[PDB]
Amino acid sequence: RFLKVKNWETEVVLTDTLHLKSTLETGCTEYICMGSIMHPSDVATKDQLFPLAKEFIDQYYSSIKRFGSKAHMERLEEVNKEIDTTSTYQLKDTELIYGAKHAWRNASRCVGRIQWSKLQVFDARDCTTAHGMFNYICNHVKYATNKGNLRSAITIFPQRTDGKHDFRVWNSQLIRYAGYKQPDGSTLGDPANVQFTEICIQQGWKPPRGRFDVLPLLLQANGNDPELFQIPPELVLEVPIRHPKFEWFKDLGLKWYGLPAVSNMLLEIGGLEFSACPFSGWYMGTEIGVRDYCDNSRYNILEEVAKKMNLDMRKTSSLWKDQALVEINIAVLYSFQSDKVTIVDHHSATESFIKHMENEYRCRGGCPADWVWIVPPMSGSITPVFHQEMLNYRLTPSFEYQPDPWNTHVWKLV
Amino acid sequence: FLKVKNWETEVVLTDTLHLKSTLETGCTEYICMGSIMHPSQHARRPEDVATKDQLFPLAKEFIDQYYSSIKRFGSKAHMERLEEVNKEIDTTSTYQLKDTELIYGAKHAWRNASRCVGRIQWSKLQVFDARDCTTAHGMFNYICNHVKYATNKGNLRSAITIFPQRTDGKHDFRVWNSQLIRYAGYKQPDGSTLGDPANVQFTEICIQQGWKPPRGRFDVLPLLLQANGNDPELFQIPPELVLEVPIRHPKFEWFKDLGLKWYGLPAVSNMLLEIGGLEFSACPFSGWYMGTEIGVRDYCDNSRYNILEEVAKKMNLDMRKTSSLWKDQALVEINIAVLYSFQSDKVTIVDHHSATESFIKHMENEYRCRGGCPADWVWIVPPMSGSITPVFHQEMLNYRLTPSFEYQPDPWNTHVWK
Ligand code: HEM
Ligand code: HEM
Ligand SMILES: CNCCc1cc(F)c(F)c(-c2cc(C)cc(N)n2)c1
Ligand SMILES: CNCCc1cc(F)c(F)c(-c2cc(C)cc(N)n2)c1
Ligand SMILES: C[C@H](O)[C@H](O)[C@H]1CNc2nc(N)[nH]c(=O)c2N1
Ligand SMILES: C[C@H](O)[C@H](O)[C@H]1CNc2nc(N)[nH]c(=O)c2N1
Ligand SMILES: [Zn+2]
Structure with missing residues (x-):
């Protein structure tokens, strides 16, 4: 057949x-x-x-x-x-x-x-302890980052x-930014990471309470309680986001990390x-420019960027969101390429x-x-995959989802 | 559940x-x-x-x-x-x-x-x-009345x-047109395509059926109507019934010089x-258009009007590498223009955010x-700006309920001529 x-x-x-x-x-x-x-x-x-x-x-x-x-x-x-x-x-x-x-x-x-x-x-x-995991992960980060030439x-x-002695990285990715719910309902940093940030703080992490705090690693070895470790900052390659035409874009104060490293699968x-x-691996720019920056649940910068662009935001049919979205993604790609950090745009990818x-x-x-x-989250049909019929089926070996550790882990301390 | x-x-x-x-x-x-x-190909009754x-x-x-x-x-x-x-x-x-x-x-x-x-x-x-229709002429009358009712001077219904x-199955009624109103497409001597490349084959059938093509970029195709299984017949939709929108941009005065237009009435006729x-x-x-149907697919698909190149040039974008996102930038401007133009002409259209x-x-x-x-x-999910629309984040279940609209073979693949 x-x-x-x-x-x-x-x-x-x-x-x-x-x-x-x-x-x-x-x-x-x-x-x-x-x-x-x-x-x-x-x-x-x-x-x-x-x-x-x-x-x-x-x-x-x-x-x-x-x-x-x-x-x-x-x-x-x-x-x-x-x-x-x-x-x-x-x-x-x-x-x-x-x-x-x-x-x-x-x-x-x-x-x-x-x-x-x-x-x-x-x-x-051969790893047996969270300290060993930390060492292995640092070596991974350093090798993968490779001074921007990502591998x-x-x-x-x-x-x-x-099932009682699981090794788990509690982080969803190795490098992500913290999120802090403010008393007034606003969020500082990445709203997606508010819960995980709370877990870190509860485990003893002293948060800087900034907009781009690299989260600590929360590492669980052999089913023991997870342990906090700060990734050495010199191993976390970041890219300040600027725009090749809009000098004010750098004033948004945006940055992202270079290394997309999924750790919860x-x-x-x-x-x-x-x-x-x-x-x-390395980033496709829309991951940052479309989802991380412009999801309503994430950094949600469309309004601010469109404001600085002087766009008409009184009606949706002005496509002010679409216009701002493209510029943001231009900035993401330009910034990574300028810093010689591997990135791929959605067209090439x-x-x-x-x-x-x-x-x-x-x-x-x-x-x-x-x-x-x-299909990328913007400009779908101008990429060739949009027009490509695909068959989806599950082959093994495979990467799979698994429940978040804080929902299944049974704690041991005190 | x-x-x-x-x-x-x-x-x-x-x-x-x-x-x-x-x-x-x-x-x-x-x-x-x-x-x-x-x-x-699961059908509810045999062919x-x-x-x-x-x-x-x-x-x-x-x-x-x-x-x-x-x-x-x-x-x-x-x-x-x-x-x-x-x-x-x-x-x-x-x-x-x-x-x-x-x-x-x-x-x-x-x-x-x-x-x-x-x-x-x-x-x-x-x-x-x-x-009660019995002839392609009666089908033309019915279709004209439909188009006129549906258009309603731009207040589409x-x-x-x-x-x-x-x-x-030997006496089928068919509108051979895929949509009631579409533009012709012509193979050029050099090998490029004039007009809508999707409609090159249909245009050739029309020409072969006696249609005299004006051979422009936006030639409204004739209706090719088949009644009671007989050979299909050509009819020219009265042009006063075909509402069209010249495409211009609220900011780029040069955009109108691209000579683009589209028709107001999306009218699927091959299902x-x-x-x-x-x-x-x-x-x-x-019904009425969502802007992206025109601005993204019709205008910017590579196998359709493919206008990104032309537009990006006039916008003076860096088109050397994909990572300048020059295609994406032009894509937005084109879709701004389409919406602006329909709205300026009081022709019903919906943007992908509202839709x-x-x-x-x-x-x-x-x-x-x-x-x-x-x-x-x-x-x-719209073909541009997917994740900034709410449907991108909406899980959906797809299943087939009846009554339904179904695909069917193109009639020229199955029609035995007389
Ligand atoms: C080398 C460059 C790579 C690029 C450009 C790339 C690109 C992408 C993108 C854009 C996504 C969608 C991410 C999202 O929307 O959240 C994705 C998902 C995924 N990637 Fe790749 N990736 C790369 C490397 C890798 C590697 C090295 C692995 C594993 C060894 C991997 C495994 C996966 C898996 C499993 C998913 C799906 C995650 C899920 O289902 O939630 N990727 N990739
Ligand atoms: C009234 C405003 C309407 C809007 C804004 C609208 C919007 C759309 C859009 C954007 C598509 C995708 C088109 C494409 O990508 O080719 C679509 C598909 C479709 N529409 Fe609607 N539509 C409308 C009315 C209708 C009506 C009146 C009918 C039937 C009575 C209908 C039946 C369908 C069907 C069956 C499809 C799927 C076509 C296929 O599978 O190829 N629509 N519509
Ligand atoms: C459990 N679901 C996570 C999905 C996800 C989120 C994320 F933030 C990412 F960055 C990547 C991803 C992963 C890799 C290896 C390369 C790349 N470009 N992106 C994948
Ligand atoms: C058989 N597959 C054709 C799909 C298709 C193509 C097309 F060109 C259209 F315009 C519409 C369509 C139809 C209606 C009723 C409203 C609307 N906005 N679009 C649907
Ligand atoms: C292969 C893929 O299914 C095909 O390109 C589809 C994708 N999604 C689409 N979505 C809409 N609305 N219209 C289309 O024609 C298509 N084409
Ligand atoms: C509901 C829908 O399945 C969900 O929003 C998906 C859509 N497609 C996606 N595509 C990618 N690459 N990443 C995602 O997170 C999603 N989210
Ligand atoms: Zn399925």
């Missing part, structure tokens, strides 16, 4: 066979589509783990043209022994690297996957065991769950994603892609 | 309407086809003249639904109607809708149209019953004109209206009174 996808701009038609390998649920049913649901839908038993492990080891050995080899069969034998005797197993380093890369390759929501195979994998499975990287902490490889697996998609169809038989996420 | 969350407002709506869905979406629990243009046990269940379902809608389920009139539809099918292999049922069905096909952001207006739909339903198993293959319907806000309001109304609102996020 085959499924065809068409680009309505180029009329290129691609043929997806890879969807036949999909495993887990999309959330849709035959009569309901949940493609715009953000999160649709304790630890694996021995019986559940065997086939998951087998399928992963089979696909690892197929990828390296060793399917059915003696090494393939001995690895299956060996994996089965550990599951039988220990109720889990340990990945070889090669398998960990392959697994991490393919979870990225399989991330249907990620427009940046043309880069999937160039992923630096830091094996942190993709992931750091993989020990896998889940009984779960990496699943062969049925193993890596609950702490921070990964980082979606263009590369189409090339990647077509290549994946050619060499892999498909490429799961979540149109709702792949 | 299924919940949808708005991630900006944290409003959660609980959907039960989806339990009434009838057609496959194309998705499965293993694959999502949400961005496929035509994901499913041509259904047997009785194929059509009657669909008719019963619709009549049941109609009589439920007016609090008359099981009433004398309801049961008589069932008996009547049963006899009609028994004796003609089809049945005929009452005017009230026709109107109910058309409004509900609109209400059920998951891709339409304009549905807050759904019950304000003028329905023109053209089921939503309307649908419904021609005779399909019978055996199929399905009510109770009956298929109305010619059912042109029209998307109305749709969120419509969603809430529908969840409150109806228990759900099928909505296709991929189509509802």
Whole structure:
């Protein structure tokens, strides 16, 4: 069986066979589509783990043209022994690297996957304490940031065991700014991070109470209570936002960090769950310029920018929001490029994603892609992905959502 | 029950309407086809003249639904109607809708149209019953009346004109035009395209049918009308019925020199209206534009008028690299101009901010009174400035309710000429 996808701009038609390998649920049913649901839908038993492990080891050995080899069969034998005797197993380093890369390759929501195979994998499975996690994360940040020449990287902490000894980065990203609810209902800093900022403060963090306070790391090792650590400031590369034409833009006092590093997802490889697996790449500008800066729930700067632009804001059909949004995103890109910090604009990124998609169809038989996420949050139809039909399905290894740690963690101190 | 969350407002709506869905979406629990243009070929009755046990269940379902809608389920009139539809099918292999049922069905096909952001207006739909029509000339008359009513000197009014339903499939009524009013497209000797590239093929059919093209950039195409399965016939819409808006910019006096215009009346005419198993293959319907339809898609798609280059040049933007966002900057100015121009000419238009806000309001109304609102996020989110409209942050459930508007093959792919 085959499924065809068409680009309505180029009329290129691609043929997806890879969807036949999909495993887990999309959330849709035959009569309901949940493609715009953000999160649709304790630890694996021995019986559940065997086939998951087998399928992963089979696909690892197929990828390296060793399917059915003696090494393939001995690895299956060996994996089965550990599951039988220990109720889990340990990945070889090669398998960990392959697994991490393919979870990225399989991330249907990620427009940046043309880069999937160039992923630096830091094996942190020997880590035992939050201090060790901090050290591993600093090394990750420093390597990934690379003085602005950003390099993709992931750091993989020990896998889940009984679900009671989870490693977790409590931060949603490694680098984010604090948010502080004011008594008057206004928010200082990033409103998205108010709750997490409260948790940090409650754990002892002394907040500067500024607009762009880099949050401390809140790191949980082995199911213990999480611990606070300040990322050394010299490792946090930031970009002050200015505009190439509007001299007043710098007066807005905006900055952002260079390193987008997601740390609250779960990496699943062969049925193993890596609950702490921070990964980082580089920014597409609309992430900052459209969502971080202009979401009504985020820094919400449209009004201020439009004011300084002298736009007519009395009516929506003046498209004053649209006009200000473009300029903000111009500023974001100009600023990063001026500081020689890796960034990709949505046009280049979606263009590369189409090339990647077509290549994946050619060499892999498909490429799961979540149109709702792949299309940029501005100027959608002038990017090529808008016109690209996509099939969404869940391949493993995969990155998955997991509950926030403060909702499941049971505290131990006092 | 299924919940949808708005991630900006944290409003959660609980959907039960989806339990009434009838057609496959194309998705499965293993694959999502949400961005496929035509994901499913699941039809409620086979392609041509259904047997009785194929059509009657669909008719019963619709009549049941109609009589439920007016609090008359099981009433004398309801049961008589069932008996009547049963006899009609028994004796003609089809049945005929009452005017009230026709109107109910058309409004509900609109209400059920998951891709339409304009549905807050759904019950304000003028329905023109053209089921007595027999010739392309009569179809032209009906369409002219529709266009004139709908246009209303720029105070646009939503309307649908419904021609005779399909019978055996060899006697189809079709408007071969994809929309009642579109501009021609011409292949130039050098290889470029003049006018609307989407309509090059249709334009060639027209020319081949005897149409004399003026070969300009905005030549309103003739109507190509097919009645009772016969060869289609060309008709020129009276130009006084075709309201057009010259596009100018409130700030850039040079914008008018681009010579752009668009027509006021968006009037889709290639879709199929399905009510109770009956298929109305010619059912042109029209409302009024959301500005982005013109300013983003019509004007700025690469395979349409593709005007970003021209506009950015006149704006003196740096077009060397994508990261100057010169396309995005021109895109906004174009859409400012379109809205400004329609508004200056007192032609109904809605901007994507107002339209998307109305749709969120419509969603809430529908969840409150109806228990759900099928909505296709991929189509509802405007093609520019997505996340600064509320619908971007609105989770949606997409499912297929009947009555409905369906796609159908282009008639030139299926018509055996005479
Ligand atoms: C190298 C440059 C990269 C670029 C330009 C890029 C771009 C993006 C963008 C724009 C998004 C949407 C983010 C949002 O809207 O919140 C995204 C999502 C995502 N990225 Fe990539 N990314 C990159 C690297 C990576 C890497 C290295 C990984 C993992 C190894 C990764 C995994 C993911 C995942 C799992 C998502 C979806 C998150 C979710 O579902 O909530 N990306 N990416
Ligand atoms: C009255 C004002 C209306 C507005 C502002 C409006 C807006 C829109 C827009 C922007 C689209 C997407 C168009 C595209 O991207 O090609 C759309 C699609 C659609 N509209 Fe509406 N519309 C209106 C009236 C109507 C009416 C009166 C009907 C039917 C009686 C209708 C039925 C549909 C359908 C079926 C689609 C989906 C078309 C497809 O799947 O290809 N709309 N509408
Ligand atoms: C759990 N859902 C988080 C989604 C998210 C939020 C965010 F703020 C990001 F920055 C990225 C993201 C991640 C990577 C690796 C590259 C990139 N460009 N963006 C992804
Ligand atoms: C078959 N798919 C065609 C989709 C389509 C194309 C188009 F060009 C339009 F103009 C509208 C449309 C229709 C109505 C009633 C109002 C409105 N604003 N737009 C819809
Ligand atoms: C409701 C909707 O699914 C939600 O707002 C999505 C839309 N598309 C997105 N796309 C990206 N890249 N990131 C997002 O956070 C979202 N949010
Ligand atoms: C492939 C993709 O589904 C296709 O480009 C869709 C995307 N969303 C759309 N949304 C609207 N309103 N109109 C369209 O034509 C499209 N095209
Ligand atoms: Zn789906």
